Enzyme design. Structure first.
Site, PDB file in Angstrom:
ATOM      1  N   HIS A  44      25.418  80.987 -57.523  1.00 30.29           N
ATOM      2  CA  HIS A  44      25.033  79.582 -57.610  1.00 30.29           C
ATOM      3  C   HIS A  44      25.571  78.954 -58.896  1.00 30.29           C
ATOM      4  CE1 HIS A  44      22.421  80.597 -54.270  1.00 30.29           C
ATOM      5  NE2 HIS A  44      21.982  81.630 -54.973  1.00 30.29           N
ATOM      6  N   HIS A  71      22.978  78.416 -68.588  1.00 26.79           N
ATOM      7  CA  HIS A  71      23.933  78.205 -67.503  1.00 26.79           C
ATOM      8  C   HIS A  71      24.224  76.714 -67.444  1.00 26.79           C
ATOM      9  CE1 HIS A  71      19.941  77.528 -65.791  1.00 26.79           C
ATOM     10  NE2 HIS A  71      20.550  76.571 -65.124  1.00 26.79           N
ATOM     11  N   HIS A  77      25.479  73.283 -64.663  1.00 26.81           N
ATOM     12  CA  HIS A  77      25.745  72.686 -63.360  1.00 26.81           C
ATOM     13  C   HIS A  77      26.923  71.744 -63.559  1.00 26.81           C
ATOM     14  CE1 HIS A  77      21.749  74.015 -61.996  1.00 26.81           C
ATOM     15  NE2 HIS A  77      21.483  73.876 -63.284  1.00 26.81           N
ATOM     16  N   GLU A  83      22.555  67.104 -63.483  1.00 19.85           N
ATOM     17  CA  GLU A  83      21.333  67.068 -62.685  1.00 19.85           C
ATOM     18  C   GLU A  83      20.469  65.878 -63.096  1.00 19.85           C
ATOM     19  OE1 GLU A  83      19.773  71.141 -62.504  1.00 19.85           O
ATOM     20  OE2 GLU A  83      20.779  71.147 -60.550  1.00 19.85           O
ATOM     21  N   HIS A 107      21.926  74.091 -69.409  1.00 19.34           N
ATOM     22  CA  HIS A 107      20.495  74.405 -69.430  1.00 19.34           C
ATOM     23  C   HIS A 107      20.266  75.692 -70.231  1.00 19.34           C
ATOM     24  CE1 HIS A 107      19.661  71.898 -65.557  1.00 19.34           C
ATOM     25  NE2 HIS A 107      19.746  71.169 -66.656  1.00 19.34           N
ATOM     26  N   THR A 134      15.255  73.734 -61.324  1.00 19.54           N
ATOM     27  CA  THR A 134      16.067  72.925 -60.411  1.00 19.54           C
ATOM     28  C   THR A 134      16.761  73.742 -59.327  1.00 19.54           C
ATOM     29  OG1 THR A 134      18.124  72.936 -61.696  1.00 19.54           O
ATOM     30  CG2 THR A 134      16.473  71.230 -62.280  1.00 19.54           C
ATOM     31  N   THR A 135      16.585  75.063 -59.314  1.00 20.96           N
ATOM     32  CA  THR A 135      17.007  75.898 -58.194  1.00 20.96           C
ATOM     33  C   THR A 135      15.793  76.604 -57.608  1.00 20.96           C
ATOM     34  OG1 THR A 135      17.467  77.720 -59.724  1.00 20.96           O
ATOM     35  CG2 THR A 135      19.290  76.321 -59.090  1.00 20.96           C
TER      36      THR A 135
HETATM   37 ZN   LIG Z   1      19.895  74.684 -64.423  1.00 22.34          ZN
END
Ligand SMILES: [Zn+2]
EC number: 4.2.1.1
Length: 258
Positions: free
Chosen positions: A62, A92, A94, A104, A117, A196-197
């Site tokens: 992901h 990590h 996005h 995000e 993040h 958020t996942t």
């Molecule tokens: Zn994140």
């Protein structure tokens, strides 16, 4: 159907396996800067990363996670809206398929090219696994990325990505200093939210910095070369791994600055 970011398994589908996706404190959100209230009782934020010990980097299908040894009191976040000490476990990003999207959180609907993040757990709960059973178990420092000048401190991450192209690949990744990913100012917005996942658990005090960092086009292009798929499966580029903004549901966003 393993969750992901595609048409048949993406964010609009997550609620079927994770009904908390429609809960009262979901992340990310749009940050309406005109309705965020300055809170002068907010203590200064303390980001103490000088003894951080990275161990590994992992493509989990992901994103990619840079993991830290969190067995000692070494890379901690405290102050600001936080009531205790929170320890860094991983960071990590996005990012988008295009520079015009990828973050995000948004700022007055503006989308950045990417979002970093840094995930920390509240040390009063002993480890990450027990912290995610608590409504104040996590604190996530979010940092926006825009495309412009290169960020030198990001380059060590960029250069290991070719060794973790596909899902499940990991590589040794020691001595990476996350201080090189931080902007000048620690001015922030804060609000209560979630991962958020999946599993989307509502553990998070979000601390989103106002000042983006700049990364080069070449740096983000290398993020887009990663794969969601495992080795030996059809190639699907790891791009657009962002959850869109979710309903604020009467939460308030506080600002550390005027
Ligand atoms: Zn994140």
């Amino acid at each position: 159907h393993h969750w992901g970011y595609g048409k048949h398994n993406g964010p609009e589908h997550w609620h079927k396996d994770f009904p908390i996706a429609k809960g009262e404190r979901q992340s990310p959100v749009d940050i309406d800067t005109h309705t965020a209230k300055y809170d002068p009782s907010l203590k200064p934020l303390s980001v103490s990363y000088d003894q951080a010990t990275s161990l590994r980097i992992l493509n989990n299908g992901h994103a990619f996670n840079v993991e830290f040894d969190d067995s000692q009191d070494k890379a901690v976040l405290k102050g600001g809206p936080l009531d205790g000490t929170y320890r860094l476990i991983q960071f990590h990003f996005h990012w988008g398929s295009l520079d015009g999207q990828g973050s995000e959180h948004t700022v007055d609907k503006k989308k950045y090219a990417a979002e970093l993040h840094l995930v920390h757990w509240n040390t009063k709960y002993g480890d990450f696994g027990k912290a995610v059973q608590q409504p104040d178990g996590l604190a996530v420092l979010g940092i926006f990325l825009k495309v412009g000048s290169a960020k030198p401190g990001l380059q060590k991450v960029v250069d290991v990505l070719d060794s973790i192209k596909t899902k499940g690949k990991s590589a040794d990744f020691t001595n990476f200093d996350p201080r090189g990913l931080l902007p000048e100012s620690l001015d922030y917005w804060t609000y209560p939210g979630s991962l958020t996942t999946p599993p989307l658990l509502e553990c998070v005090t979000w601390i989103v910095l106002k000042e983006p960092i700049s990364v080069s086009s070449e740096q983000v292009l290398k993020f887009r070369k990663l794969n969601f798929n495992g080795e030996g499966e059809p190639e699907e580029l790891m791009v657009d791994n962002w959850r869109p903004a979710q309903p604020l549901k009467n939460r308030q966003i506080k600002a550390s600055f005027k």
